[PDB]
């Protein structure tokens, strides 16, 4: 039980803090949405009633 | 792609056969290192011990959130450097003079006392006091106790030599001595412990001479007992299987053609007529005997890794199946087969002899949950007065081998029905006779055929000499606490019917050529590689609160890196390969939890953690020795405190009370020009953030133009080092006064100054002597040639 | 809808949606889409398109022309997410309810 | 919106899964095992849509 027995937990906390503080100052640039189309058709075989 | 680890284990054992003589347990001579102090004296009976930077590492914390992190970094890096100079060394050597018909032995360890004459400018009245100091430096002996309760309590002799220097050096050497003499013991205690651990009297440890009894040695922090081996149970089955596989490279099977000839001779049928027994063993192959032998031995050791047979048939039968089941029943002992397999073969046997029953009904009526009672009932029926069928069995073995090891051993079953004599041992009776014949949807077997088959499965009795050495050399190298482990990789306990039948009919046994010391030398390696990781976890990761069991998976990447790094160096290839080969059945999370539990039960963290904790307060106490200072002060028209004028002519020390302090640096560095001017106009200002400064002590002869305290380029920006200047007041020139001209000429309008500065003054030369400890090799010498057993005497 | 083989293949190999943008980028994109929709809607309220002047098929075309003109006069040409969405899936709606939307 | 923001997919190739299955499911060849064949007859061409 000494200050050396906390290095891993301290590194975990520091990693989380640096991730948060890097995300805070990151510039946001909204990307234009493209590639929207109706191309999700469904195949299959017809029933073709007999008579 | 499972064969890539086969050669890995082979190479691990091959490199294990290499000596690799590590120089552990053996110590070496060492001397205390010398620091620098550069002392001087301004006037009579006052001597100044100026502090000089010792180690110049450590980088400031940019986050500025904490101050203790800076000190921790300094201490950790300094002691990482220091611990590399006393890896396996004890301080024993020191510079004596003699002890011959003059005064007793006296010591000259610090800077020579003669050299102080030209450094301190001593007068005649005090130089006469120097010889008495030299002649009063006697050496005092004492005793100190070493060893813990688990080890032996011993006593070693020590010395307390005087030397000249600063108190800081004394504290440094005290810390070094405390750190360097942990886990020490004498040979006479280690020999007693070793003899107590080896109970057998065949082993004879080399007797100690009189001179080697008080010699000093180094022992590990904590011994490897059975407790450590107990906690490795969840993954022990993999180690047992791969230890058997890597050491059993042969098998003693008689060629199949010979048994075929024997059976044909024993048969009571005409050659030209057809009997299915002789036409079923003809299509048998023995290429895979080795794998079945390994599995057989593993089933013999662990009582829960019982062998399970896989039956290609589903509901119907086949001519080969009946004869193979009979061979298994008559030749493979029942203790090494699982309950399901026993019940299946018992049902196959019982179907033919039953009056009305078939196979499909007997399976369909029964359930796999309680097949043990069914197996017992079938065995009882088959051991009656109407039918008798000998069921192969085996007994335990207590015998072992003499060898040095630190764990107990236990009894195991034997993978063959031999009872140390040629005659096998069965469970019910050694006679074969039937009331009627055997029929099951056809496939008639005559009564005499079973009796004939009984006489062909015997062991030749000649190979019994080699059949037991592998076996006794198998009850002498496997820890007894692993015999209750579970099974993690199921396929290690599975084998098809034909292979098992061929193994049983061929009468094969495991064999090996390796010795006994090789296997214990590998088990010790596994234990050591577990203990290293346990110690590292205990000295780094052990922390109750703050992301314990309830932590996100995100942190696992951080946690696992240290374990992987420790597993990545040489000498740990066995455990690393076993881990990375079977990750699917044993995920890393359970391994990490098991290691944490092992380290948390009980384990010495390391000698270095407490040492670093002890050095951190030292770093706190004396800043100047480590070349750092906090709370610099900027102001114009400074005022000197006139208390340090008694030692220096000009000094950067002031006593101004601050007003309107700045939070930290890199802020004043960029506010605005003519905006910070008001800050210094209202009064002195202070910069909290710690810096990296070096003091320059100059005689009153030259100057060092630093002039870089403040750089004027559109802003009053500070520097990054802030070198200062001191001019020493020596006896040569201490009545004249300096005009203070050459102290602001190389400066700017705004002056950078220091608030606090610590130095140690001494009134008499008798206070220049301190103490260090040593070993006194004369009475407790450093050991050599560690304890060994006796063999090759010539 | 998905084939059994496709779902089984997706589940056999450990598969999961993967992105490359931060939260801020997504929020800004959604805000831009909302702002464009709101501006177009507020601009379209000045001109008058009653349902009794044309047939149910021609009124839709007049609405398309008005929307394109309004987008051209004031806004900078981007992609007009809502316009593309309504164009690409107008065949799955009977004309009356498309006009209602 | 989900299609626009979900650019790629992460998945272990079927080559590794086949090796893992071969290691875990140790069965002799020519023994009429169907799980191996069924796994072999698969592909991961369409993972984005799913």
- Residue B92 burial class via C-beta count within 10 angstroms: exposed 0-12, middle 13-18, buried 19 and up: buried
Q: B760-762 and B510-511 as β-strands: parallel, antiparallel, unpaired?
A: unpaired
The helix (run of H) or strand (run of E) holding residue A16 is helix A7-25
Asked whether the beta carbons of B60 and B119 are under 8 A apart, the reply is no
Q: Is B307 helix (H, G, I), strand (E, B) or coil?
A: strand
The count of other CB atoms within 10 Å of the CB of residue B137 is 20
Residue A37 at interface with chain C, using a CB cutoff of 8 Å? yes
What are the helix (H) ranges across B55-123?
Answer: 68-83, 116-120
Residue contact C15–D13, C-beta within 8 A: no
**Technique used to solve these coordinates:** cryo-EM
What are residue B161's DSSP bridge partners? B772
B697 closest CA partner among B742, B650, B760:
B650
Asked whether the beta carbons of B496 and B309 are under 8 A apart, the reply is yes
Residue B41's contacts (CB-CB under 8 Å, 6 or more residues apart) are B47, B48, B120, B121, B122, B730, B731
| Tokens 């050497």 -> residue | B173
Report the alpha-carbon distance of residue B571 to residue B548 in Å, rounded: 31
The count of other CB atoms within 10 Å of the CB of residue B20 is 9
What are residue B158's DSSP bridge partners? B142
Residue B656 DSSP one-character state: P
| Tokens 């001087």 -> residue | B40
Q: Is C5 helix (H, G, I), strand (E, B) or coil?
A: helix
Report the alpha-carbon distance of residue B415 to residue B420 in Å, rounded: 12
Report the alpha-carbon distance of residue B52 to residue B36 in Å, rounded: 7
Asked whether the beta carbons of B482 and B298 are under 8 A apart, the reply is no
Structure tokens at B558: 């951080």
Asked whether the beta carbons of B415 and B510 are under 8 A apart, the reply is yes
B391 closest CA partner among B404, B401, B378, B403:
B378
Q: Which chains touch D (3 or more CB pairs under 8 A)?
A: A, B, C
Instruction: List strand residue ranges (DSSP E) for B258-404, in order.
Output: 308-310, 396-397
Structure tokens at B462: 């000649």
Residue contact C12–D39, C-beta within 8 A: yes
Residue C89 DSSP one-character state: T
Q: B632-635 and B751-753 as β-strands: parallel, antiparallel, unpaired?
A: antiparallel
Residue B251 DSSP one-character state: E
Residue B581 DSSP one-character state: H
Instruction: List strand residue ranges (DSSP E) for B301-392, in order.
Output: 308-310
Residue B516's contacts (CB-CB under 8 Å, 6 or more residues apart) are B401, B403, B473, B476, B477
Residue C88 at interface with chain A, using a CB cutoff of 8 Å? yes
What are residue B718's DSSP bridge partners? B710
The residue in chain A having the minimum alpha-carbon distance to the alpha carbon of residue B612 is A4
- Residue D31 burial class via C-beta count within 10 angstroms: exposed 0-12, middle 13-18, buried 19 and up: exposed
Our CA-based measurement puts residue A43 at a distance from the nearest CA of chain C, in whole angstroms, of 11
Report the alpha-carbon distance of residue B163 to residue B37 in Å, rounded: 14
Q: Is D8 helix (H, G, I), strand (E, B) or coil?
A: strand
Asked whether the beta carbons of B72 and B617 are under 8 A apart, the reply is no
Instruction: List strand residue ranges (DSSP E) for B256-348, in order.
Output: 308-310
Report the alpha-carbon distance of residue B312 to residue D32 in Å, rounded: 10
Chain length of chain D: 50
Structure tokens at A16: 């989380």
Asked whether the beta carbons of B94 and B774 are under 8 A apart, the reply is yes
Q: Using alpha carbons, list the distances in angstroms from residue B71 to B172, B527, B758.
A: 16, 37, 18
Report the alpha-carbon distance of residue B259 to residue B284 in Å, rounded: 11
Report the alpha-carbon distance of residue B489 to residue B584 in Å, rounded: 9
Residue B610 at interface with chain A, using a CB cutoff of 8 Å? yes
Q: Is the dihedral of CA B591, B595, B598, B600 positive or negative?
A: negative
Q: Using alpha carbons, list the distances in angstroms from residue B763 to B45, B46, B768.
A: 5, 5, 10
Residue B124 at interface with chain D, using a CB cutoff of 8 Å? no
Angle at B175 between CA B172 and CA B180, to 5 degrees: 125
3-state secondary structure B472-484: HCCCCCCCHHHHH
The residue in chain A having the minimum alpha-carbon distance to the alpha carbon of residue C31 is A30
Residue A31 at interface with chain C, using a CB cutoff of 8 Å? yes
What are the helix (H) ranges across B507-606?
Answer: 517-540, 556-568, 573-581, 588-601
Instruction: Select from D19, D21, D24 the residue whose CB has the most chain B CBs within 10 Å, as the one to mutate to test that interface.
Output: D24
Q: B154-164 and B769-773 as β-strands: parallel, antiparallel, unpaired?
A: antiparallel
Residue B335's contacts (CB-CB under 8 Å, 6 or more residues apart) are B393, B394, B413
Report the alpha-carbon distance of residue B308 to residue B494 in Å, rounded: 5
Asked whether the beta carbons of B140 and B772 are under 8 A apart, the reply is no
Report the alpha-carbon distance of residue C90 to residue C70 in Å, rounded: 20
Quote the longest CA-to-CA distance of chain B.
Answer: 135
| Tokens 């009656």 -> residue | B384
B243 closest CA partner among B305, B172, B297, B313:
B297
Report the alpha-carbon distance of residue B542 to residue B562 in Å, rounded: 13
Packed helices B556-568 and B573-581: angle between N→C axes, nearest 10 degrees: 140
Report the alpha-carbon distance of residue B344 to residue B268 in Å, rounded: 29
Structure tokens at B332: 């493979």
Rg of chain C taking only CA atoms, in angstroms: 19
Q: B695-698 and B154-164 as β-strands: parallel, antiparallel, unpaired?
A: unpaired
A34 closest CA partner among C20, C29, D31:
C29
Report the alpha-carbon distance of residue B660 to residue B131 in Å, rounded: 56
The helix (run of H) or strand (run of E) holding residue B724 is strand B724-727
Asked whether the beta carbons of B299 and B307 are under 8 A apart, the reply is yes
Asked whether the beta carbons of B402 and B203 are under 8 A apart, the reply is yes
Chain length of chain A: 51
Report the alpha-carbon distance of residue D29 to residue B512 in Å, rounded: 30
Structure tokens at B709: 């305290």
Our CA-based measurement puts residue D30 at a distance from the nearest CA of chain C, in whole angstroms, of 25
Residue B367's contacts (CB-CB under 8 Å, 6 or more residues apart) are none
Q: Which chains touch B (3 or more CB pairs under 8 A)?
A: A, D
Report the alpha-carbon distance of residue B609 to residue A2 in Å, rounded: 7
Residue D29 at interface with chain A, using a CB cutoff of 8 Å? no
The count of other CB atoms within 10 Å of the CB of residue B569 is 11
Q: Is B624 helix (H, G, I), strand (E, B) or coil?
A: helix
Structure tokens at B172: 């440094």
CA B569 to chain centre: 12
Region of residue C13 (left: phi > 0; alpha: psi -120 to 50; beta: else): beta
Structure tokens at B161: 């030599």
**Half-sphere exposure (Cβ direction) of B406: Cα atoms closer than 13 Å:** 17
B59 closest CA partner among B82, B79, B76:
B76
CA B120 to chain centre: 53
Rg of chain B taking only CA atoms, in angstroms: 41
**Half-sphere exposure (Cβ direction) of D27: Cα atoms closer than 13 Å:** 13
The helix (run of H) or strand (run of E) holding residue B158 is strand B154-164
Instruction: Select from D3, D46, D48, D49 the residue whose CB has the most chain A CBs within 10 Å, as the one to mutate to test that interface.
Output: D3
What are residue B445's DSSP bridge partners? B438
Report the alpha-carbon distance of residue B746 to residue B698 in Å, rounded: 15
Q: B412-413 and B396-397 as β-strands: parallel, antiparallel, unpaired?
A: antiparallel
Q: Is the dihedral of CA B524, B526, B528, B531 positive or negative?
A: negative
B163 closest CA partner among B29, B51, B37:
B37
Please enumerate, as own/partner, the contacts of D23-31 that have beta carbons within 8 Å and a separation of 24 or more.
Answer: D23/B1, D23/B2, D23/B584, D24/B491, D24/B584, D24/B585, D25/B491, D26/B2, D26/B491, D26/B494, D28/B496, D31/B312
Residue A34 at interface with chain C, using a CB cutoff of 8 Å? yes
The count of other CB atoms within 10 Å of the CB of residue B590 is 11
Instruction: Give the resolution to one decimal, in Å.
Output: 3.7
Q: Is B21 helix (H, G, I), strand (E, B) or coil?
A: coil
The count of other CB atoms within 10 Å of the CB of residue B412 is 21
B648 closest CA partner among B640, B639, B636, B656:
B640
Region of residue B351 (left: phi > 0; alpha: psi -120 to 50; beta: else): alpha
Asked whether the beta carbons of B373 and B343 are under 8 A apart, the reply is no
DSSP secondary structure string for all residues of B161-217: EEEES-HHHHHHHHHHHHHHTSSEEEHHHHHHHHHHH---SS--BPPP-TTTTT-EE
Asked whether the beta carbons of B508 and B253 are under 8 A apart, the reply is yes
Asked whether the beta carbons of A23 and C22 are under 8 A apart, the reply is yes
The count of other CB atoms within 10 Å of the CB of residue D41 is 8
C41 closest CA partner among C98, C76, C77, C83:
C83
- Residue B250 burial class via C-beta count within 10 angstroms: exposed 0-12, middle 13-18, buried 19 and up: middle
Asked whether the beta carbons of B358 and B317 are under 8 A apart, the reply is no
Report the alpha-carbon distance of residue B173 to residue B772 in Å, rounded: 7
Structure tokens at D29: 């060849």
| Tokens 């020579």 -> residue | B112
Asked whether the beta carbons of B350 and B381 are under 8 A apart, the reply is yes
Q: Using alpha carbons, list the distances in angstroms from residue B149 to B183, B531, B602, B780, C72.
A: 12, 21, 15, 21, 90
**Half-sphere exposure (Cβ direction) of B706: Cα atoms closer than 13 Å:** 23
Backbone dihedral angles phi then psi of residue B539, each to the nearest 5 degrees: -90, -5
| Tokens 């890794």 -> residue | B305
The helix (run of H) or strand (run of E) holding residue B718 is strand B716-718
Report the alpha-carbon distance of residue B393 to residue B395 in Å, rounded: 7
Asked whether the beta carbons of B760 and B627 are under 8 A apart, the reply is no
Asked whether the beta carbons of B601 and B231 are under 8 A apart, the reply is yes
B592 closest CA partner among B557, B636, B641:
B557
Q: B28-30 and B89-91 as β-strands: parallel, antiparallel, unpaired?
A: parallel
Structure tokens at B596: 């944490």
The count of other CB atoms within 10 Å of the CB of residue B779 is 12
Backbone dihedral angles phi then psi of residue B462, each to the nearest 5 degrees: -85, -30
Residue C89 at interface with chain A, using a CB cutoff of 8 Å? yes
| Tokens 């079953």 -> residue | B413
Please enumerate, as own/partner, the contacts of B361-370 that have beta carbons within 8 Å and a separation of 24 or more.
Answer: B363/B315, B368/B340
Report the alpha-carbon distance of residue B375 to residue B240 in Å, rounded: 30
The count of other CB atoms within 10 Å of the CB of residue B161 is 23
Backbone dihedral angles phi then psi of residue B328, each to the nearest 5 degrees: -60, -45
Angle at C82 between CA C78 and CA C83, to 5 degrees: 75
Q: Using alpha carbons, list the distances in angstroms from residue B613 to A1, B72, B610.
A: 10, 9, 5
Report the alpha-carbon distance of residue B351 to residue B373 in Å, rounded: 17
Our CA-based measurement puts residue D46 at a distance from the nearest CA of chain B, in whole angstroms, of 26
Chain length of chain B: 794
Residue B713 DSSP one-character state: S
CA A30 to chain centre: 16
DSSP secondary structure string for all residues of B435-449: SS-B-SSS--B-HHH
Residue contact C8–D47, C-beta within 8 A: no
Residue A32 DSSP one-character state: P
Instruction: List strand residue ranges (DSSP E) for B742-782, in order.
Output: 751-753, 760-762, 769-773
Residue A33 at interface with chain D, using a CB cutoff of 8 Å? yes
Chain length of chain C: 101
């Amino acid at each position: 039980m000494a200050s050396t027995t906390r290095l891993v937990n301290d590194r975990k906390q520091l990693e989380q803090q640096v991730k948060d503080d890097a995300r805070i100052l990151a510039d946001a640039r909204g990307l234009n949405i493209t590639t929207v189309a109706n191309d999700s058709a469904t195949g299959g075989q017809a029933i073709r009633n007999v008579g | 792609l499972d064969n890539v680890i086969k050669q890995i284990e082979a190479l691990s054992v091959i490199v294990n056969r290499s000596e690799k003589a590590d120089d552990a347990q053996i110590l070496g001579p060492n001397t205390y290192k010398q620091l620098l102090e550069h002392l001087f004296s301004p006037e009579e009976n006052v001597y100044i011990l100026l502090p000089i930077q010792a180690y110049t590492g450590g980088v400031i914390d940019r986050r500025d959130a904490s101050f203790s992190n800076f000190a921790y970094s300094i201490a950790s890096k300094l002691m990482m450097e220091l611990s590399a100079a006393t890896h396996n060394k004890i301080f024993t050597d020191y510079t004596r003079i003699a002890a011959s018909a003059l005064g007793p032995e006296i010591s000259t360890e610090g800077m020579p006392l003669f050299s102080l004459i030209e450094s301190l400018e001593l007068t005649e009245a005090e130089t006469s006091r120097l010889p008495v100091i030299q002649d009063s430096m006697v050496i005092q002996k004492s005793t100190a106790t070493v060893g813990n309760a688990q080890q032996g309590i011993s006593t070693i002799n020590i010395k307390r030599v005087p030397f000249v220097g600063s108190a800081f050096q004394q504290v440094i050497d005290q810390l070094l001595w405390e750190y360097s003499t942990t886990s020490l013991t004498t040979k006479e205690q280690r020999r007693q412990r070793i003899t107590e651990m080896v109970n057998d009297r065949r082993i004879m440890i080399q007797k100690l001479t009189l001179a080697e009894k008080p010699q000093v040695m180094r022992h590990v922090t904590t011994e490897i007992n059975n407790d450590l081996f107990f906690k490795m149970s969840p993954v022990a089955q993999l180690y047992i299987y791969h230890l058997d596989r890597a050491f059993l490279d042969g098998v003693g099977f008689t060629p199949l053609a010979e048994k075929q000839q024997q059976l044909q001779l024993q048969l009571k049928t005409n050659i030209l007529t057809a009997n299915l027994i002789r036409s079923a063993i003809n299509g048998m192959n023995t290429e895979s005997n080795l794998e079945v032998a390994i599995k057989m031995m593993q089933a013999a050791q662990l009582h829960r890794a019982s062998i399970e047979i896989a039956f290609p048939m589903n509901v119907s039968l086949s001519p080969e199946i009946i004869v193979q089941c009979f061979i298994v029943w008559m030749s493979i002992p029942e203790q090494l087969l699982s309950d399901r397999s026993n019940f299946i073969i018992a049902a196959v046997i019982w179907a033919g002899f039953s009056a009305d029953d078939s196979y499909a009904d007997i399976m369909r009526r029964s359930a796999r949950a309680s097949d043990r009672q069914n197996y017992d009932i079938i065995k009882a029926a088959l051991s009656s007065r109407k039918f008798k069928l000998p069921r192969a069995s085996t007994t335990l073995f207590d015998e072992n081998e003499p060898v040095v090891r630190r764990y107990q051993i236990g009894r195991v079953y034997a993978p063959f029905p031999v009872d140390r004599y040629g005659s096998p041992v069965y469970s019910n009776c050694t006679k074969v006779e039937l009331a009627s014949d055997y029929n099951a949807e056809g496939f008639t077997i005559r009564k005499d055929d079973f009796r004939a088959l009984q006489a062909v499965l015997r062991i030749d009795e000649d190979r019994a000499a080699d059949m037991f050495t592998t076996l006794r050399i198998m009850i002498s190298s496997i820890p007894a606490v692993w015999y209750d482990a579970e099974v993690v990789h199921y396929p290690h306990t599975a084998v098809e019917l034909e292979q098992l039948a061929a193994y049983g009919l061929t009468g094969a046994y495991p064999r090996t050529n390796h010795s006994v010391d090789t296997i214990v030398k590998t088990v010790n390696n596994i234990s050591a590689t577990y203990s290293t990781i346990a110690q590292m976890l205990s000295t780094i990761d052990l922390d109750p609160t703050r992301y314990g069991t309830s932590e996100s998976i995100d942190k696992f990447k951080i946690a696992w890196e240290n374990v992987e790094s420790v597993l990545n160096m040489e000498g740990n290839d066995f455990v690393k390969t076993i881990m990375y080969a079977y990750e699917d059945n044993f995920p890393k999370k359970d391994f990490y939890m098991m290691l944490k539990q092992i380290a948390s039960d009980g384990q010495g963290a390391h000698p270095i953690a407490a040492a670093i904790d002890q050095l951190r307060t030292i770093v706190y106490r004396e800043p100047e020795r480590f070349g750092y200072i906090d709370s610099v002060i900027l102001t114009h028209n400074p005022d000197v405190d006139t208390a340090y004028n008694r030692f220096f002519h000009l000094h950067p020390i002031v006593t101004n009370q601050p007003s309107n302090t700045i939070k930290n640096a890199q802020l004043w560095n960029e506010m605005r020009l003519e905006q910070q001017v008001e800050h210094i106009k209202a009064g002195p200002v202070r910069i909290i953030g710690p810096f990296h400064v070096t003091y320059n002590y100059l005689s009153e002869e030259e100057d060092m133009p630093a002039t870089s305290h403040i750089i004027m380029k559109d802003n009053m920006i500070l520097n990054d080092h802030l070198t200062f200047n001191f001019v020493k007041r020596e006896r040569r020139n201490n009545k004249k006064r300096v005009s203070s001209f050459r102290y602001k000429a190389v400066e700017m309008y705004v002056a950078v100054r220091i608030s606090r500065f610590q130095l140690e003054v001494l009134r008499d030369l008798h206070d220049l002597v301190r103490s260090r400890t040593y070993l006194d090799v004369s009475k407790s010498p450093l050991a050599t040639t560690p304890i060994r057993v006796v063999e090759y005497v010539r």
